[model samples]
Target: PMAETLEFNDVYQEVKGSMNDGRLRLSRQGIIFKNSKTGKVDNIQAGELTEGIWRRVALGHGLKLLTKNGHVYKYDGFRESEFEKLSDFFKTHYRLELMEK
Candidate 1:
């Protein structure tokens, strides 16, 4: 069987509220890549706690994680488990892998 890979643009598309005639562009949210490449089940949040680096992982879905200024975080597991984790200043781009699902 194959796994599911997800992709998302750095910037979100335009959205209208009331007028529905204008479009607004948001800031660059960087990138997020999560996966589980070495395990039986996918662990999306694996190795995401690192600091100052951009990484890519292969699980069931293609996820991209990034940092702004110097902070990185994710809402993994459940909604209640969502929290912010401190990260170092990004010096360069990095790539990694997650377990399998």
Candidate 2:
């Protein structure tokens, strides 16, 4: 069975055209983003996320996911609790080895 889904609140996603407020859903399989205003959806599979070329850039507030498609998905303007929750999810479920800066 899978654990509870990790939800990020008050997130601002940075895309090619524009940046908007949305929420991010992180499950065992992958990450999904839904824009509340535009009602747009974007997702990245877990396998693709774990593969090469996908990198996690830790930000001062939240973090950024650099996908293989050469796009950066950032989670900014989030609460501290939400930020830590997502960080834990990335390190634990995503098996990401975070390096000290």
Candidate 3:
């Protein structure tokens, strides 16, 4: 089985409202996080993912995905081209829908 994947270049993970540099991959199965820089690899499953949103950030583009357990995977470091490409990929393969706030 094949699934779409997006590299989270220089994305930051939130920990108690603090941000830290980390890497991750978003796929149809889930979001796989590598935590060597933070020691908290959180692999969130597709069923666990509750919401996906595109929003504005202070500096770069943002894609925030919230899980059922309340864990949020927010990618706010991608450039316009990168963010658009990734968003398109997700929209195509994963049937990703943006949740309104």
Candidate 4:
């Protein structure tokens, strides 16, 4: 179990296409996005995450996570340079892919 963590700043989550300002967090325990607007704690277990979709959006870059339950969590505002680190992390730690659009 790793105590170290990684993430991106100025990230925002979109549900119903509304931007909820927050920061993305990747911990060994799970993925967390703390909504600064409504204080919603978006938590996803790394063990059950099925996919990570990366796309270019209005706000820098966007990433969508697909869960086994078909629940999709989409977030934007990641810098382009951070993609490699994130993709590598997903590949190594979660054994997942961060597909580009």
Candidate 5:
């Protein structure tokens, strides 16, 4: 059973080089990103969610993830103040440390 821990809309994701519009939702089981353009949802299971990184960006703030398989994902559009909340959630739920830069 999955529960919604956090929800974010009007987010922007950078896949490789291009920017895409998406919405992000985080649950205890996984992280989901729904593409605003294509209407596709991507799930990153917590079992493989190895690392979390928080950084400042022109879009306000961004979060990056490095999974166990060496895959990388970056999402921007969060408020700067959200760092505290997200970092705490990642530690408590995902058992992952959030590196802030």
Candidate 6:
């Protein structure tokens, strides 16, 4: 049977717990922000991007596509200063969760 959709609080809790257990760091510098910030780290908060459309993903966090500040983002395979935008989705949603392999 299909489960019901989770409430906002429930979804948040589930996402938070799963992310923590999965070792997905709350990065301010998501995959998209890597190139813009040089070598520094960016660990963004849950509500930090509250003004935008942040989707809570079922995808386990690793290194994949994400949206933040309305920009669609991607992590690079070559450089340390990675994480660049694949598109301009940052104007809509914040980067939520990474899909685990």
Where is model 4 poorest over a 10-residue stretch in terms of lDDT?
Answer: 1-10
Clashing pairs in 2: none
Q: Give one digit per residue, the lDDT tens place, for model 4 in 1-101.
A: 23357867688887787888988898766799998877878788898899999998778888888999999999888888778777877877788989999
Worst 10 residues of 3 by lDDT: 92-101
The segments of candidate 3 whose C-alpha lies over 4 angstroms from its true place after superposition are: 1-3, 99-101
The number of clashing residue pairs in model 2 is: 0
Residue 4's lDDT within candidate 1 is 28
Best by lDDT: 5
Report the CA-based lDDT of candidate 6 relative to the real structure. Answer: 0.28
Candidate 5 residue spans exceeding 4 A from truth: 1-4
Q: How far in Å is the alpha carbon of 66 misplaced in model 1?
A: 7.0
- Order of candidate numbers by lDDT, starting with the best: 5, 4, 3, 2, 6, 1
Alpha-carbon runs more than 4 Å astray in model 2: 1-3, 16-18, 50-60, 98-101
How accurate locally, in lDDT, is each candidate? 0.24, 0.62, 0.67, 0.83, 0.85, 0.28
lDDT per residue for candidate 3 within 1-101, as digits (tens), equals 23377776587765555666778787767677776575877787777766788766654666788877886676565665665666565666656775422
Give model 6's clash tally: 26
User: Candidate 5's residue-wise lDDT over 1-101, tens digit each?
Assistant: 23349888888888765778888988889899999999987889999998899998668899999999998899988889888778877887898989988
Q: How big is the positional error of residue 22 in model 6, measured in Å on the Cα after superposition? A: 24
lDDT of 6 by residue, 8-71 (tens): 1111112233321211223223311222223333344444443322232453222333334663
By TM-score, is 5 or 6 better? 5
lDDT of 1 by residue, 7-91 (tens): 3222111113111111111112233332222222112232343432222222112112333333433222212111111111122
Error of 1 at 37 (Å): 31
